[model samples]
Target chain A: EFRDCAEVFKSGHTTNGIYTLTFPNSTEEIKAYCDMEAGGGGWTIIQRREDGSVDFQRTWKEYKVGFGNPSGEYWLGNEFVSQLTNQQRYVLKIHLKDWEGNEAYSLYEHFYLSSEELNYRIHLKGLTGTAGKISSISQPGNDFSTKDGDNDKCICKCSQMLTGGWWFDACGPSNLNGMYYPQRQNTNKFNGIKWYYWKGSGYSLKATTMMIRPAD
Target chain B: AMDLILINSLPLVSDAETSLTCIASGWRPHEPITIGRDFEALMNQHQDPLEVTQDVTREWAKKVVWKREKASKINGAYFCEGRVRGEAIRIRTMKMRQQASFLPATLTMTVDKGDNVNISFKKVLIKEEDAVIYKNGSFIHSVPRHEVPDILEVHLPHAQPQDAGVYSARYIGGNLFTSAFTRLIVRRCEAQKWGPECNHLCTACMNNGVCHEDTGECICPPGFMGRTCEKACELHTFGRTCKERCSGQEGCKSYVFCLPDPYGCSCATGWKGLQCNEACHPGFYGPDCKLRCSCNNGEMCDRFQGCLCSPGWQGLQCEREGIPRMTPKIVDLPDHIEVNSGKFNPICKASGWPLPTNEEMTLVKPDGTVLHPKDFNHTDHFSVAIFTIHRILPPDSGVWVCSVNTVAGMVEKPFNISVKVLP
Candidate 1:
C-alpha cells in the first residue's frame, strides 16, 4: 500500500556535464531543490579525509531502492563511501556518470549541521522533492496508513544533521536504516529488493542510521 | 466449574425466545471464547455471560455470576445461549416485552419412551392397556383400564430400541365405545446416540470413550476427561500424551503455569531454576532478576513490594527517606507566586536546621545581573541579603536565593519573588 511520488526523484531535466550543488543548514532543501534539477541516475556522494581533500564516494540510484514494514526508513550510505557523523563538519562531493559513460565530479565545499532546534516538512504535492525549517511536522494519526503515505517527509539542518549520510523511509520512522539504496544487497545485478542474514536469507537491511537518532 | 444452573423460570411464552442464566463459580477461567455460546450445556466459568466486552480474556479473576445472552431460543422447554465470537462490540439497545406458554402448538413430543418426558393433559377415563401404545405400527407399553389425572405420567422402567416406532395413544371401550386418539407419541434413543433428542454426537471425546446420554460430556476411562476430554491427563503435558500421574513439582506453588514437561518442574515470573522451582534471590526481581530492588540493606526484593526497605524507608520502590536523623533541612518556603507590583514590601520566611543568613546570599535581577546584599533581619528564618533596587518593577523581578552560612555550609533554596500587578 506504500507508493512513491518519484516526481521529485524524477529530475527536471537531463544534462551532459558534471552537476554540483550544496545543501547547507540554512538552506530550505526542498524549496531550493524544487527550483533546480533533481533526478535519479548513477550518482555519487563523496566526502573528505585528513588532508581536507575529497576521499569518500558512495553510489546512488545505481538500482531501485526499497524498504518494508510500512512506517519505516533508511539512512543513506554505502559500505565504502564513509557515512556522515552527527554534529560534524566535512567537505562533500556529488559525482555523476553521464550518458556517454563519462564520469564527472562536483567541486568540493564544506558543510556542517547546527545545534538549534529546527522543523521539517515533506511536501508531497507536485512530485517535488521537499524539506524545510520554514515549517514544522505532522501528527500522522496514531500510526501509518493514516495519511495514505502521500504526506510523509523529512527535515533536518546540517548544524545537527549530516547530509553526508541520508535518511528516508515510506510513511514514517525515517530516522534511519533502509533495505534499499547504497547498501549492497544479496542478489544478482543488484536486482529487486533482497535481504541477507549474511550467509543466510534475512528479513531486513542493516540498520546503521539508527546509529544516530532512531526515535520519532 | 458451574456452581448451579436452572431454567430461571418456566417460559411463559411459546413463540418468543427468553433470557437464561447459567451460573458458574471458580477461581480461574474456563474459556474466554466460549461463554455466550449454545454448545450443548458446558460451563466456561471464566466468562461473564451476556457481557460481550473483550476484557474477559484468558486471565484468572474472582467469582462473578455472568448473565447469559438476553435472547436465546428453545432447546426443549428452554432455549440456551452459546459460546464465543469475533464480535466487534458496539453498544446497542432495544425495547419490547411478551409472555407465553411452553407447548406452543408443538402438540406431540416424539420422545423415546426410555427418556424422561413431562406431558400434561386433560383428565380422562380409559384402560391404560386398552389405550395400547404402538411403535409406529406394532404394540408397545401400556397400563390397565383405569381413570387418570390430567397428565399421562408413564415412568416406563426402561424401554427398548424398537420402542423407537411411533407409539400413539387412544382407547377402545366396551361395546363399540371406540375412542378417538388424543395422542402422545413415544420413541427410543438409538444405540451410540446421546442428547434428549438423541441428536448430538460424541466426537469431542478422545479415544473410544462414550458421551453421557443427556450432557454430551465424555465419560472418560481412567486418566482423562474434560467436558469432552479436551485434554488428556493434565493441563500442561507433552510427549506421548501419557495419562499416568506422578508427584507434583516441589517449591513450584504459585498458581502460575509450569513447563509443559511430564515432570511438571518449570515456573515463570520471578520464579527460576531448572524446575522454575524458586523465587528470585535477595535484592533482585523481574526478568532473569535483571531488575534490582530499591529496598534498603538487609531486606528482600519483593519487586512488586519493591525491595523490602530494611527498617527505615517506605514506598512503592522504597525510594523515600525512612530512618530518622538530625541532618539539616530547609523545612518551609513560600511558593513562587504572582504579586502586587505597587507594594514596596518584602516578606520572606523559611525554617531549617542551619536557621540563619549570609552575605553570599546575593540577589539576581531578572536580567540575570547579580546585585549586592543590603538589609539584615536574622530570625529562625530571615531576609539578610537585599537587592540594590527596592521598587516593585525595578527590583521585584529579581531572582532570590536565601543562603545560610551555617555549619552545614551554603544551605540555600533558590526562589523567584512575585506580586500581583493591577488587573
Candidate 2:
C-alpha cells in the first residue's frame, strides 16, 4: 500500500504554523494547495511557490478577511499544488497577518486540503474571531460524513473551544453546542446529516477520510 | 491043386463078420488121442477048409487035391493051434505087430518170481529138422523147437512200467499150431519219505504270481484274479500293481484302468510342484517358473510388484533428487564480528571474519577456506560467512559489500565473494 501527503487545498486556514501530513509509509512525492474563504477581511495568504520562492496575495475586502490576511502572502493554489507526485510525506507552513485598522477583525475563514494517493479531503473553518488582531487558533476535529451532505459542507468543524483555546469563553460555545447543525451558528445539531466546514486559524486540522488503494 | 502058407502079426484083434466078398477093416482113435508107431490093425475072421483042383482031363488018371487058407492077422492073446501040413505040426515062431494109442504131448509153464516165461512145441510132426520159434508178450523170445527141452528157462531185463501185461507164444509147424499165454504183474517201487514237500503243487503259475502251495492258490496277472488264477481285475483296475488311477483331463497314456491322482495338474510356466502352485524367484517366471525377466543391475525384480526406487525424482519409482545450478554472489553478514575464537579453528588462530589474503598466503590456506566445507568445525559460523562461488575463473577480482544496520540495533554487513579467474 502506498500513501502520500495531502496536496490540494480545499477549505482551511493557518497562522504562523507548520502543518504536516504523515503517510502510513513512504511514497514517491507530495503536493499541497491553499485556498481562501470569501468572508475574511484584511487577511493575507502566504504560500510556497514552485520556483522555490514565497508568493503573497491578499483578500478582496479591506477589513474583511477571506481565506488569507493582507500584505498578499504566498498562497498555494489548488492548480499549483495538485501537480505534485502522489507518493510522499509533506509539511505546509502558513504565515498569516492582518494590517487594516477595522474594529471588527477579518477572519481567516476556510482552508482546504487533500492527498492524491490516500484520496483524503479535509476542510478547516473559522480561522479567526472578531478583533482586528489574530484572535484564536482553532484546531478542528473531523466533521466530515458521507451521508446527507453537500460537497463543500462535508468538512472538519473548526472551533477554538474544541481545541481548549482561549476563544471558548468569548465564543460561549461548548463542544456540544458547536456541533454540526443545519444553521451555521445554531446550537441544535442534526445527526447523520449536516457537516461543518473549517474556516479558522491557529492550526489547520485535518478532516481527512483515508482511502487505501485496492491491492494489486 | 494049390499050395498055401500061414502067418500072424495082428494086435488088439476083434471078431469080424465076412460076407462072401472079401472084407477088410481097421480101428483108429479120434481127437485128444494119439497113435503110436507101434499101434497096429487087427482082423477077426473064421478059417474055412477049401479044395482046389487043376485037372488035365477026366479021362486021364483023375486025382483031387485039398488045401487050407493061410491066416496072417494078429490079435491080443491070440492062440492058433492048427496043423497045416503035416511037416509043420508045431508052429513055435509067430511074429505079431503090437498096436497102442498114446495121448498128444501137453505142455504147462509157470513163471518164476523174477523170471520171464515161454513155451514151444509142434502139433504136427515134421521132418527131422525144422525151425519152430515163439515169443512171450512183446518182450520174451522162444527158442527153436529142436532146442526146446521139456521146460525152457527165460530171463527178463529190469522190468519197468510198460512191462506188466499178458504174454503169448505160438509155434508154427505147417501153421499156427502151438500157443501158450502168461500174465505179468509188476509192483511199484516203495516211495521214499523225504523232508517236507508241497503236496499241492502249482506248476501252472511258474511262481511268477503269488503262490499258495497249501491250497494250490495262485494270484494271476493284472488282468486275471481268483483262487485258481482265473479271475481278472475289475473294470478300471490295471497294471501289475493294479493301483493305477485314470486321468480326468486327457486319457492316461500307459494304463487306462486307473484314475489320475487328485492333485496332478499341468503347471504354468514359472511354477512347479505337484499342482504347479509355487512361483519362480524374483524377475523370473514360466513353467517351472524359472525364466528371469530383464532387470537392470541384476537387482531382484519382485514376482508380484516390480522394482521400487529411492527418493526425490522418479524412474520406475522416485529415486533421484534435482540438482540446481549454483548462483554465486556476495551475501550479507552479521554486524559487529564477535570473533568467538573458541569456535574457530585454533590451529589457524584466525577469527571468523573475512580476511584478505595475498596470492602466496592464499595458497597456504586449506581448500576449505576457499569455499565452505560442510565438515568445517564451526558450521554456524561457516554457513553465515561463506558465499558459494560458481563459474569463476582464476585472477584477482574486486569485491563488493552491502551493509545492513537497523535502527533497532540489528546490523549485518554484506561480504564480497571475490573469485580469481586464471589467465
Candidate 3:
C-alpha cells in the first residue's frame, strides 16, 4: 500500500486552450515556457490517463497555429541545466491561447519546472518587461525557481517562439536592448532555428518554423 | 534528444561467422530500420521463458528488416522456445573508419591462457614490417622497426587454451591483404566456465574483482558498480573513477567520498553544512558566512550572529518588514561608494552621503565581498550606488561598501573607488 501519485488536476492557475493535467509522477521530460505577447498561438496537450483520481496519456505535444509573436526576447535551447535528469514532479495544465482563440482562466505562467533535456545552446542574458497576465500559473524548479524569477517584478518577453513567451521591453535601460533571443530545436538545413526574428541577423529558419525531432 | 547508435558494441563470439554491419547514417543515410534482439537470464526470477523448464531461452531476433545483403542468428543460447520464422538482416561488416576500428567489425579478444595480448594495426598497415609475427595459423617472433610498433603485444609466457586460432598477418604493403586478421578465441577460464558452448558461472567479483574469463565483462572494483562489483557507487555519485562527482552536492546521496573527509550530505532542506552543500544564504552567518547582518530578515540563530524569526517578521535582531506595518524601525545605511576604479556604472552613496530614504539594502566589498541581493545588476535609486562589474578589478580596490538595517541598528557606507591612473 504505497500511495502518492494523485494530483489529478494541478495548475493552480493557467488554463484556456482546455484543461486536465495529472501526470503527477514517474516522469522524464516536459518543457514549457510562455512569456508571450502580440497575441499568442495555441493547442498544447499532455492528455492521457489510466485509473482513478489521476493516471496518464497525452504523451506530449506543442501543437500550433499562428504561433507566438515575438518582438525581441526568446530563450529555449536545451539540456545542460546541468546534464538534467528525473525528479518526478509532473502535472501540467496549460492552455496558452492568442491566435485569436483566447484562454487563461488561470495560467499565470509560473513554471520554474526546470527541465531542458533538449540539448545544446544556452546563453541566458536575462529577460524583462515584467507583469501579471494571470491566465493560470505553472510552477517549476530543480534550479529554475518556482515563479517570476530573480528580480521578479513579473517580467514578460515573447513576440515569437511559437507562442511560448512574450511581452518584450525591460532589463535595465531596456538597453540590454532586449534581444538575448533564442528558442531552438528542429535543427537542419537551408535557413533554420525553429524560429527567430528579433531585429534579424543572418536570418534563416524559414519553413515557418522547422521542428524535426523524435524519430522513435 | 537526438541520438543514433546503429551498432555500438555487439560482440557475441562462438563460431565467429561475425556478421551484422550496414553503417550509414549521416542523417538518414542508407535507411533500413526495425532492429531487434532479445534474450533473457541473469535470472533470479522474471520468467516466461515460455514458462521456464530449465535450458530456458526466450529469444526475440525477429524484429527484423536490416537491409543490404542481410543474414541473422546472433546467438539465442540454443533453444528458448521457438521454431524460428520470418527474420532477415544483412549489413555484412567492413572495417576502417578510424580510432582502431572503434569496434565496428572484427575485434574479438577473449583471453585466458598465459594472458597478455595487445594487437593493434593500421599505421598505414604496420609502419613497414620489421620482423612481423604470427601464431595458430603459424610463425612468430620479434618485429623491431627501430622500436617494434603498430600494437602487437603478445607474451604467452606459457601459452595454452590449446592456443586458439586465425592470427595471420600480410601487409608488407603489397597494399593491404591480411593486414593482420586477428581472431583469437582462446579458451580455459578453467572448468570451461563461459557462455555459448562452455556454460556460464564466473562473475561474482570483489577485490579479486574477477579474473573471470571472457564474455559478460564485469571488471569493476575500486568503489564498486553493477554487473557485479555488487553495487555501491551510484549518483550525486562518488569516485575512484566512477566518472567524477561528490562534494558538489546535487541530489547527492553520497556514495564514495574519496576526499579528505566530510561527505555526508542528505541535504535538500535549505541545505546547511558539511562543506556548504549550499543554501543557508541571506546575510549568511559565521565561518563561511562571509559576514555582515542586522537581521531585519531574521535567521541569524545566535551563538555568533543573532536573530532567527523570518516568514512575515517576528522578534530579536529582526528589525521588521511587515506582518503589521512591520516595526523595529529599519535603520542601517551608508558605508561608502565614491566610484571610479575603471568603472562602468557606480552610484555609491547612502545615509551620510545624503540620499538614503532607507528602503532595504546592503553591499560590501572592502575585501569582505558580500554584494548579494539578487547579486548585482541594480542600475539606480537606493543611495544610487549600483554596480554591475563585468570587469572592475584592481583588487576591485578600496572604497566600495554600503550597509542597511534599521530600528537604529547597523547602517554604514563606503565606495570611494576612484583610480584614473592613465600611464
Candidate 4:
C-alpha cells in the first residue's frame, strides 16, 4: 500500500540508480568497508575498469575508519555462493556473536559493478567482541578424503554440490579448500572465475567478486 | 094713518161717468123727528116715520136720494148676506172676475233659469228677492245667453218629494217674474246598469280566465269561475281549465307552484322545482348533479379522487419509517524500521562503533494504549512506527531513534539504530 524499498524492488529493480543503506549506531561503529578485490591485503585497492571489468590495482576505499584490521571474516551459504561474479551483482551477509557465543545475522547488503563506479560499502560496529571470522564457505569444488592405512595419496573426490556431478577432487590440496586464486593463474578447473568465498569464525563466511558487463 | 109716495127717475151718464143718488122714506111717527139734527137723538125721540119729503132736482134729489140709496144699499147688502150662508165652496167658484176698474196688484216670482220644473202652475207667486224653490224635480238647465255666459246654477238644498214642480217666467218691467205650483211628484236617481255603454264595468274576464266578449261571461282565474267571478277550481286541478294534476311525488318543499300562463313550478333556496336541479348551498358546491364533500379538522382527505397526505409524511399514503450504520475499532502500521545489532547481540565486535540494519518493524496494541513488541500479537487498538536514516555531511556515527505516540497516553518503544556515514 504505502511506498517502500521492498515495494520498489518487488515491482522491479532499477539500474544505474543510487540506493542508500543506513546503519544504526550499533553497526556504524564497525568501520565497514567494501571493494572488488578477491583477497585479503593490507592496503590493496580494486577498481572497476571502463569495460565493465574490475581492475585490481586501481580501486578506492569508499568508506574506512581507523579502528581494527579491515579484514573481516564470514560464513557463506549456497544462496550466497551462487551470486558472486567478476562483473555482476553480489550480496555480503554479516553476523555478530554475543558474549555467550550466540550469533545474530544482519540484513543482507547488495553490490553491483558495471565500471560506472562500483560505489558500494559495508560497515561493522557496535559489535561487542572481536571481529568474527569466516569458518565455512559453500561453493562448487572437489571433495577429497583420507582412507585408513592408504596414505599413498588422497583420492580425488570431486562432488558437485552446486551444479551436477563430480569432476575433480575440489577438497584436495591443489584446490586448497576455498582459497582465493587469481583468475589468470588458476588453470585447472577455476578459469575466468567470477565468484569467491572466505571461511572464518563460528562457521561464518564472506562472499565477494568482480562484476563484468555482459556482451552486446 | 100714514101716507107713502113712490117716485122713480132715470139719470143718463157717459160711459166713463160715475153717478150719485139720494132717497127718502117715512112712517107714522111716534114722536116728532128732526132731519140731520143729531141723528142719535132723533132716533131716540122718534118711534117711526109717518111721512117723508121727496126732492125732485138732481141736486136736491142727490141730497134726498140718501133714502133710496140707503134702501138699495140695504137690498144689495141683504142679497150678499143671503148668498154666503154656511156651505163648502169650491175653489173654482171663488175665482175673481176680471174687471176694468179693479186695480191688479203686482205678483212677483223668482227662478234660477237652470233649475228644472216638475209640474205646471198658473199664478204661483213669489217675491223677486227670494229664490225659486223646487223639490224632487229634474231641472234642465238652459244654456246661458252670452258667448261665455255665467251659468245660472241652482243647487236644490233639500229637495223633497213635494218640491217637484214646474216653473215658468215672463218679463215684467225690467225684471222677469216667475210662478210655479206642484202636485208633489216623486222620482229617484238610480245606479247605472252594466251595459256596453258603461266604461267602468269589466265585460271580459281577467287573470287567465277566458272571456266571452259578446255575452259578457268570465271563465275565471285558475282557481275561480262563474259569471260574476265567484267560483274556484277543485282541490286537485288548479290551472285555467282545471285540467292539470300534481304528481304529489315530491311536494314543493322549498318551492312554489306557478298558475295560469306558462305555469309549472318555481324553486325556493335557488333550487329549480320539479327536478330540483341547482347548487346554492355554501361550501357544499358543485354542479347540480353531485353531492359536495367536506374536509374537516385540518385534514385533507379526498378519497374519491386521490389520496393527499399531510405534512411531515410522504409516500403513497404516508405509511413508512427510518434506520442507520456501524463502525469498527482498529489501527494500522508504518513501513520501515532500523535495528541495532550491537545492543541485540554483543559477541560480534565492531572495529569502531556498531550500527543497525534496515528492517521493517511491526508493533501491536491490545488496550488502545501501549505498543507491544513485534513478538507480541493482538488485534485491539491502534499502533504504528517508521524509521529512515539519511547520511549527512561529515558523516557522524551515532544512533537514531524513531517512536510513535498515541492520543490514549501510550508511547511506542523507540526503534533504536546506530550507523556511521563515511566522510
lDDT of 1 by residue, B39-120 (tens): 2211111222344333222222112122245342222121122121222111010101122111111122333436654433
TM-score of 1: 0.17
lDDT of 2 by residue, B1-423 (tens): 000111111111113210010000010101111111111111112233322222232111111121112322221111112122122111111111111111011111222223443333323323222222222213223222233343333335555424443333333222221223223333222111111353334424311233433233332332322233222233333222223322223222221011011101122222333222345566653223333444444444543223333333322222334532121112433322222212221111112222211110111111112223222223322122222233333232222232111111111122233443233
Better of 1 and 2 by TM-score: 1
Q: Give candidate 4 regions above 4 Å deviation.
A: A1-16, A24-52, A56-191, A194-216, B1-423
Best by TM-score: 1
Q: Each model's C-alpha lDDT? A: 0.29, 0.24, 0.29, 0.22
Tell me how each candidate scores on DockQ against the true complex.
0.00, 0.00, 0.00, 0.00
**Cand. 2 TM to true fold:** 0.12
Badly placed stretches (over 4 Å) of model 3 are A1-216, B1-108, B111-188, B191-210, B213-218, B221-227, B230-423
After TM-score superposition, what is the CA distance of residue B249 in candidate 4 from its true location, in Å?
99
The alpha-carbon deviation from the true structure for residue B302 of candidate 2, after best TM-score superposition, in angstroms, is 99
Compute the lDDT of residue B194 as modeled in candidate 2. Answer: 13
Of the true interface contacts, each candidate retains a share of 0.00, 0.00, 0.00, 0.00
Candidate 3 chain A, run of 10 with poorest lDDT = A207-216
Measured by C-alpha RMSD in angstroms, how accurate is candidate 3? 39.1
All candidates' TM-scores? 0.17, 0.12, 0.15, 0.11
